[PDB]
Design a protein around this ligand. Structure first.
Ligand SMILES: OC[C@H]1O[C@@H](O[C@H]2[C@@H](OC[C@H]3O[C@@H](O[C@H]4[C@H](O)[C@@H](O)[C@H](O[C@H]5[C@H](O)[C@@H](O)[C@H](O)O[C@@H]5CO)O[C@@H]4CO[C@H]4OC[C@@H](O)[C@H](O)[C@H]4O[C@@H]4O[C@H](CO)[C@H](O)[C@H](O)[C@H]4O)[C@H](O)[C@@H](O)[C@@H]3O)OC[C@@H](O)[C@@H]2O)[C@H](O)[C@@H](O)[C@H]1O
Length: 696
C-alpha cells in the first residue's frame, strides 16, 4: 500500500471531443451481456458502461514510470470467469525500448496486477491491429498463450503470473493465436491451437493438435500473403490475408475458409484488388453471418462486406462498387469533427454475441457501431463517448472567448466553447498535426498556431473561429515545432522556433520573419511575458540556461543562472512559464533538477525547495482576490508522483489527484483564469482531462 497523505478530493473528466486515435481491438464477452472491452495503441484500454452509455478508461493508474503499458497489443477475457480480463502491454520493440508486461484483473479492470515480462511488446508498431495475440484457454482458464512480435510464443499455466517460452514454436513474429474450444471439454487443456505469423511464403498459418507441444505448417494455405486474423465456427477456420501486417501498405489479400477436419481450402474473398483484408467477425450465433473489412483500400474508401450464406454471396455495406456511391449512413452528431475522416484502418470488427443485428468496428480515429445490420442501408454511429485518444501537443486556456484551445496530433486545432460537448464546428483549423498554440494575454482574441506543412503556421483575430495562414515562414523551416511559438501580450509580435530554422520574430503577423540575434539556441520552446510585450523567454534544458529578450524578440541574452541540466532526450522536462498578470514572474521546470522561480524577468532564479521534481507547471485563478494565482504542478513532491496545487505561491502543496488518476504520460498542465480549482491536463493518447474539486 502507498502512503495516503493529505489531498483534496478531485473529480477528473475528459474534455469531450471524441475518439481521435487508433483503436486496435474490441472484445465482446461471450458469457455476460453488456460486457465489452476496447484496446488502443497509445491510450490504454476501455470498458463499455451501458448504464451511462460511454466507455470507461481502465488504465489511468499507469503513470510516468510505466506509461509504455498504455500500448495495448492485445486484450483477452475468460469465458468461464466474467470478472477476469488480461492485457498484453507495451509500445515498442526497438533497442531503446523497455520490456512489456501482462496486466491481470479480477474486477473487470478496476485494479490490475502488473507482471513484467522479459520480452518487448509492440503495441504501437506495425501489425498492432492484428490479433488477438493473448488468449485464455476456453476450457481450462489457468492456461494462457501469448504471441509476441520478436520472441515467438509463450505459455502460462498460472493465469499470466509466469511465462515460459514454447520452444517447439520456431517462428518469432506472431500475428495472432486462436483456440478451437471444441477440441477439449471443460477442465482440460484445449488441444487444437492455430497461430498466424508474419510470413508471406506460405508458412504463416501453423496448427497444433496436442495443446501446443508440436506444430506444423497448414498445407494448402495461400502464398504471397500472411494470416491476419481468424474466426472458428462450425468446424471452419475463416482467415483474412494480406501482404502486409498493416495498418498500412497492404496491396494484396484474400479471405479463405479452412475445413479443420479434412484440411480443405475454399477462397471466399468478396473482391480482390490492390488491398488486403484483416477485420473479420463470424456471428457467434449464426456461422453463416460474417463481416469482413478491407485494409488499405484508400480510393474510393475501405469496404465492409456482409454475408448471410457463409460467403457464397457478399453485400457491400459502406459503398456500392457499381458507381462508388456511399450508401451507409454515418452519424457524427456526437463528434462533428470526425466527419473530416473516412473509415479506415478497419482492422477489427465484431458482431454482438447477444444481438446478431448489432456490431462495432474500429478505425484510426475511433469506434463505429451499427444497431441494425439488417437495415438497408445500415446506419453507423460514432460511439466514442468517454473514449478520448488524442495527443494534445499544446493547450491554452484564454481568460475570455473559448474555455480551451487544443493543438492535436493528426487532427488539427480545436476550439472548446464547452468541456462537456464536442466542438460544434468540428476542427477549428484543418491542418493535421498541430504542435503549438498561443494567445496574446492582453488581446486573447489573437491566437497563433503551428503545424507540419508549409507555411507551417497561422493566426486568428477572433479567438480561433476564423484563421488565415502565415504569408511567409522562416527560411529553412521544415516543421512548425512543438510548443514553439509565443505571441506578445499586445498581439503585435510573434517569436517562433520552428524545426529546421533558427528562432525568428515577426512584427506583421507572419508576413515577414527575421532571425533573432544574440546566439540563442534554436528549437527551444519560447514563452511570452503575460504583461510586457517586449519580454520573451527561452529555456535551454541541455545547458540549463535561460535566455531572455527585452526588445520584443529582436535579440536574446543568456542569464547567468546555472539551472540543473537535462539530457537531450529528456529536454521535454525543461520549460519556462510566465504567470498571467505578473510581469517578469516566470517558473522554470528542470525535471529531476526541481522547480525554480524568478520574479525579476529571469535575471536571477531561486530553487523551490518544496518540490522534488517538476515536469510541467500551470497557473489559474487565485482562491481569494489579491492572492497569488493558484499553481498547478505535475511532478514529484515528497517522493509522491502526481498532480499538485499550491495556494500560497509555491511553499506548500496539496495533491489534487490519486494513484488511480495519473493518466500515463502527462505532456503539460494549465490552470483556468475564470474558475478556481480548475485544472487542464494533456495526457498522451488520453486527450485533455480536466479536474475540479469534488463537492462535499
Ligand atoms: O509521427 C508523427 C507524424 O506522423 C505522420 O503520419 C504518419 C503516421 O500516421 C499515424 C496516424 O495515421 C492515421 O492514418 C493515416 C495514414 O497514416 C495514412 O497513410 C493515410 O493515407 C491516405 C489518405 O488518407 C488517402 O486520402 C489517400 O488516398 O491514400 C493515403 C495512403 O496512401 O490516411 C490515414 C488518415 O490520415 C488522416 O488522419 C491523420 C492525419 O495526420 C492526416 O493528415 C490525415 O490524412 C488526410 O486524410 C484525409 C481524409 O480524411 C485526406 O485524404 C487528406 O488528403 C489527408 O492528408 C491514423 O488515423 C492515426 O490514428 C495515426 O495516428 O504513421 C503512418 C504514416 O503513414 C504517416 O505518415 C504525420 O503525417 C505527421 O504530421 C506527424 O504527425
Amino acid at each position: 500500500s502507498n502512503a495516503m497523505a493529505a489531498s483534496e478530493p478531485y473529480t477528473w473528466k475528459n474534455v469531450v471531443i471524441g475518439g481521435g486515435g487508433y483503436v486496435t481491438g474490441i472484445i465482446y464477452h461471450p458469457n455476460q451481456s453488456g460486457l465489452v472491452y476496447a484496446r488502443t495503441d497509445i491510450g490504454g484500454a476501455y470498458r463499455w458502461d451501458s448504464a451511462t452509455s460511454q466507455w470507461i478508461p481502465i488504465t489511468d493508474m499507469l503513470n510516468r514510470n510505466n506509461s509504455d503499458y498504455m500500448g495495448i497489443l492485445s486484450i483477452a477475457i475468460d469465458p468461464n470467469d466474467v470478472n477476469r480480463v488480461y492485457m498484453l502491454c507495451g509500445k515498442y520493440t526497438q533497442s531503446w525500448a523497455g520490456t512489456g508486461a501482462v496486466l491481470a484483473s479480477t474486477d473487470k479492470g478496476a485494479t490490475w496486477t502488473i507482471y513484467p515480462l522479459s520480452v518487448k511488446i509492440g503495441g504501437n508498431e506495425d501489425g498492432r491491429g492484428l490479433g488477438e495475440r493473448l488468449q485464455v484457454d476456453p476450457n481450462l482458464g489457468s492456461i494462457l498463450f501469448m504471441g509476441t512480435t520478436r520472441d515467438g510464443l509463450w505459455k502460462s499455466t498460472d493465469r499470466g503470473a509466469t511465462w515460459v517460452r514454447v520452444t517447439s514454436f520456431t517462428p518469432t513474429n506472431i500475428n495472432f493465436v486462436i483456440f478451437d474450444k471444441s477440441s477439449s471439454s471443460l477442465g482440460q487443456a484445449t488441444k487444437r491451437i492455430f497461430v498466424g505469423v508474419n510470413d508471406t511464403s506460405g508458412q504463416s498459418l501453423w496448427r497444433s493438435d496436442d495443446g501446443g507441444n508440436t506444430w506444423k505448417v497448414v498445407a494448402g494455405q495461400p502464398t504471397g500473403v500472411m494470416a491476419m486474423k481468424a474466426e472458428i465456427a462450425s468446424g471452419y477456420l475463416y482467415v483474412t490475408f494480406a501482404n502486409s501486417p498493416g495498418p498500412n501498405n497492404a496491396t494484396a489479400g484474400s479471405v479463405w475458409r479452412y475445413t479443420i477436419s479434412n484440411g480443405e481450402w475454399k477462397d471466399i474473398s468478396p473482391a480482390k484488388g490492390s488491398y488486403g483484408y484483416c477485420g473479420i467477425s463470424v456471428d457467434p450465433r449464426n456461422p453463416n453471418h460474417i463481416l469482413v473489412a478491407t485494409l488499405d483500400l484508400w480510393w474510393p474508401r475501405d469496404q465492409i462486406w456482409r454475408t448471410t450464406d457463409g460467403g457464397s454471396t457478399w453485400t457491400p455495406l459502406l459503398w456500392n462498387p457499381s458507381n462508388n456511391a456511399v450508401i451507409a449512413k454515418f452519424d457524427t452528431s456526437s463528434a462533428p469533427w470526425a466527419a473530416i475522416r473516412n473509415p479506415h484502418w478497419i482492422t477489427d470488427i465484431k458482431i454482438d454475441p447477444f444481438n446478431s443485428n448489432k456490431a462495432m468496428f474500429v478505425t484510426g480515429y475511433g469506434i463505429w457501431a451499427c444497431d441494425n445490420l439488417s437495415a438497408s442501408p445500415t446506419t453507423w454511429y460514432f460511439r466514442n463517448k468517454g473514449l478520448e485518444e488524442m495527443v494534445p501537443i499544446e493547450i491554452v486556456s484564454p481568460p475570455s472567448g473559448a474555455l480551451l484551445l487544443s493543438a492535436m496530433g493528426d487532427q488539427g486545432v480545436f476550439r472548446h466553447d464547452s468541456l462537456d460537448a464536442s466542438p460544434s464546428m468540428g476542427v477549428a483549423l484543418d491542418v493535421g498535426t498541430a504542435g503549438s498554440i498561443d494567445y496574446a494575454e492582453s488581446i486573447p482574441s489573437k491566437i497563433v498556431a503551428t503545424y507540419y506543412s508549409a507555411p507551417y503556421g497561422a493566426y486568428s483575430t477572433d479567438g480561433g473561429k476564423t484563421w488565415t495562414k502565415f504569408a511567409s515562414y522562416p527560411a529553412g523551416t521544415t516543421g512548425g515545432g512543438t510548443r514553439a511559438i509565443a505571441i506578445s501580450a499586445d498581439g503585435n509580435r510573434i517569436v517562433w522556433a520552428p524545426n529546421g530554422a533558427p528562432m525568428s520574430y515577426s512584427t506583421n503577423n507572419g508576413s515577414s520573419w527575421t532571425t533573432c540575434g544574440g546566439g540563442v539556441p534554436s528549437g527551444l520552446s519560447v514563452e511570452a511575458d503575460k504583461v510586457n510585450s517586449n519580454k520573451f523567454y527561452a529555456y535551454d534544458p541541455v545547458n540549463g540556461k535561460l535566455w531572455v529578450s527585452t526588445n520584443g524578440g529582436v535579440s536574446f541574452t543568456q542569464m547567468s543562472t546555472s539551472y540543473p541540466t537535462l539530457p537531450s532526450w529528456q529536454a521535454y522536462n525543461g520549460s519556462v512559464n510566465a504567470v498571467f498578470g505578473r510581469e517578469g514572474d516566470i517558473w522554470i521546470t528542470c525535471g529531476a533538477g526541481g522547480l525554480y522561480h524568478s520574479t525579476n524577468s529571469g535575471a536571477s532564479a531561486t530553487k523551490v525547495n518544496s518540490v522534488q521534481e517538476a515536469y510541467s507547471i500551470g497557473f489559474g485563478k487565485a482562491k481569494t482576490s489579491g492572492g497569488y494565482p493558484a499553481i498547478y504542478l505535475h511532478g514529484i513532491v515528497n517522493g509522491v508522483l502526481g498532480i499538485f496545487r499550491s495556494d500560497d505561491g509555491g511553499s506548500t502543496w496539496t495533491r489534487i489527484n490519486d494513484d488511480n488518476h495519473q493518466f500515463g504520460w502527462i505532456h503539460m498542465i494549465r490552470g483556468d483564469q475564470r474558475t478556481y480549482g480548475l485544472c487542464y491536463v494533456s495526457a498522451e493518447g488520453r486527450g485533455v482531462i480536466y479536474g475540479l474539486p469534488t463537492p462535499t
